[PDB]
């Protein structure tokens, strides 16, 4: 009940509505049928202040949806650097692997977020991680023409 | 649903879904921005992922990039995948699709997946979804 | 025993040969809108040709172009499915 | 409310574009043989795309050319269905 | 089978099925006899009649005859028929089919049935079955 | 049992087998699931002597199959002139109409059998009969380039 309202408000980036819903007992770990939580939604859409509130109410920083994606995956893919840092500070698994073996580092390398790549590496990201297809973040950076990222990954490997 | 008449889907993974999202084009092509295509790409990402595909999106690809991506995909090991999908979002004309820098024949893109050229997808469905003009005719409709 | 090298492809085109394919600047292409809508509701239940036929009808019926240029006003669209498939396809 | 003038056609081609279509001088074309066989058994039970997909597989699997000319020996064929249909078709 | 998603078949008759059976060709075309085509025509007559079609077969038609037959059919009243079918049995090349005396574009034959040109078949399925070469490529197959 | 054997033998033009089957009590009016009788089969395939035997055992000369076709329809379509005469002599309905309104005269006019057209006319065939599409035998003769037949039909009409 409050769960969908929370997901909707969190998705729409409505800080005050989220705070009201939480203060009135909404389940911080509510999720839709696909395992998508308010923390996922705020991580993908870039709503930093809402991420902060959810974590304060004990949101599972490592919640995994139906596809194996965590909020750190979402933030790395959407390219939200400050949210990536906040998730990591709250214990997000830097090497979480989704159902096709993509890690947040894979997502950042593919989408071209160099600063997020740097942050992930500094927080222990596995440069050698192979997804289900046997590809590393380096491979993805090469495939998508992200040369500076490819150079950083190649140097980090050894 | 009598199983003898359905593709076998008892594989480790459904398979890869490649999306080519061409929005911005080189001034030489004289083609305009494709406003709305990002909404298409994100919608398709979510719905193909829901089906079970590993969806990967590449933006504003040159003809050479499109060719190399599909060629690469055809050379990967799909042994433990049930099928393959590719979605092309671009400008087009009859039998061709636009890369960022010009036109490439659609048949050149699909050719890599021919049964003799892509053995690990043999007897498995190969799906191509193509959002592109195929000419300039308009359908006036009828009541 | 052999299989044709051209077997097992399906092409789902947004429009028929020779024809324009319509795109709303604010909402996306008609074809993708319809395809995602149908997949969201029926993608795990129906066979691929059932899905694509429903897409054909959605595009044919729910969409019509708007333009201040009479040449481009009130136009319609039908997609075009080309199947070389040899079995029914469910995304099960 | 309007419908596209190109809607509601289906083309069932014996072969794919660019390709030969095989015919036995004594038994008839591969495509017609398969089509009649499938219709005889399932024509009043199955949807048209189900029928035509089964035809695709029958032609793909049960037929292979014979010739003393190596160029024409052991060749295969897949038909090609083009659907602009907007509903499921049963011959009920 | 959810009725909202099937063509309405509650009509007086299923409809017409026209078969063009081209076996013998003018020496000028340089095309050979199509041995086996009569077996095809008779097989198709029986199986399309079984479905409920009024099947009518025309043999060795000139291009002009094919054009006039389909044009005529498109001008008949199909109000109380559910659908329409046409089967073409001939030699062919890409996009064309052979009449007894030469080639005619397949699109010229189907054009008569366009929604704006054939109102009594509007919203009803129009089926074309085409047995003809579409080129000279051969499929070597793969094991 | 003997029914399928009879249909098969009659279809294959095996005179002696048919006579043996009939003499052993086979149902002369046996039919397959589509209402196809041995008399239909012999009429389409042109087996005159078998037609004679079946009629002698009291075959229904006007048996109608699932499509409304009678043996006279079959003979007129396949173009078997002597069988057309024999059927008429045994009371075949010269104007029987199938499910799409085709009469034997329609079939003969379409297929180009001029002598069968003459015989049907002499036996009372309705020159003005419209099939379900509103077409007369004359229309069909014209559509299919059977000019001599068209001329005969046009003259018979008035």
UniProtKB/Swiss-Prot annotation, chains C, D:
Annotated site, Involved in allosteric regulation, chain positions: 13
Modification sites for Phosphoserine: 29
Protein encoded by which gene: CASP7
Shown part of the complete sequence: 211 to 302 of 303
Effect of residue 80 to S: Decreased phosphorylation by PAK2
Modification sites for (Microbial infection) ADP-riboxanated arginine: 23
Organism: Homo sapiens (Human)
Residue ranges, annotated region (Loop L4): 64-78
Designated name of the protein: Caspase-7 subunit p11
Loop L3, as annotated region: 16-28
Entry superkingdom: Eukaryota
């Amino acid at each position: 009940d409050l769960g969908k309202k929370l997901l909707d408000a969190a998705s729409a980036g409505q800080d005050d509505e989220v705070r009201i819903l939480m203060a009135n007992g909404a389940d911080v770990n509510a999720s839709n049928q696909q395992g998508w939580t308010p923390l996922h939604a705020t991580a993908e859409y870039g709503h930093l202040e809402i991420v902060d509130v959810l974590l304060a109410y004990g949101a599972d920083v490592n919640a995994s949806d139906s596809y194996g994606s965590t909020p750190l995956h979402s933030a790395a893919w959407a390219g939200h650097l400050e949210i990536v840092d906040v998730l990591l500070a709250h214990g997000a698994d830097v090497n979480a692997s989704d159902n096709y073996g993509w890690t947040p580092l894979h997502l950042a390398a593919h989408t071209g977020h160099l600063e997020i790549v740097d942050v992930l590496l500094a927080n222990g990201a596995d440069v050698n991680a192979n997804n289900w297809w046997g590809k590393t973040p380096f491979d993805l950076a090469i495939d998508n023409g992200n040369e500076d990222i490819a150079e950083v990954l190649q140097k980090a490997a050894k | 649903r009598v199983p003898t008449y359905q593709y076998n889907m008892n594989f480790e993974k459904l398979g890869k879904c490649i999306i080519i999202n061409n929005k911005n084009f080189d001034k030489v092509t004289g083609m305009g921005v494709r406003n709305g295509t990002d909404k298409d790409a994100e919608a398709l990402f979510k719905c193909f992922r829901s089906l079970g595909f590993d969806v990967i999106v590449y933006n504003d690809c040159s003809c050479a990039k499109m060719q190399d991506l599909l060629k690469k995909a055809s050379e990967e090991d799909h042994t433990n995948a049930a099928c393959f999908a590719c979605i092309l979002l671009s400008h087009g004309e009859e039998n061709v699709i636009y890369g960022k820098d010009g036109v490439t024949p659609i048949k050149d893109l699909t050719a890599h997946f021919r049964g003799d050229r892509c053995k690990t997808l043999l007897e498995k469905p190969k799906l191509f979804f193509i959002q592109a003009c195929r000419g300039t005719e308009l359908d006036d409709g009828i009541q | 025993y052999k299989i044709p090298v051209e077997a097992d492809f399906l092409f789902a085109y947004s429009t028929v040969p020779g024809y324009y394919s319509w795109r709303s600047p604010g909402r996306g292409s008609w074809f993708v809108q319809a395809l995602c809508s149908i997949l969201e509701e029926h993608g795990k239940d129906l066979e691929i040709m059932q899905i694509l036929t429903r897409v054909n009808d959605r595009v044919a019926r729910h969409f019509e172009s708007q333009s201040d240029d009479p040449h481009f006003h009130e136009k319609k669209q039908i997609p075009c499915v080309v199947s070389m498939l040899t079995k029914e396809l469910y995304f099960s």
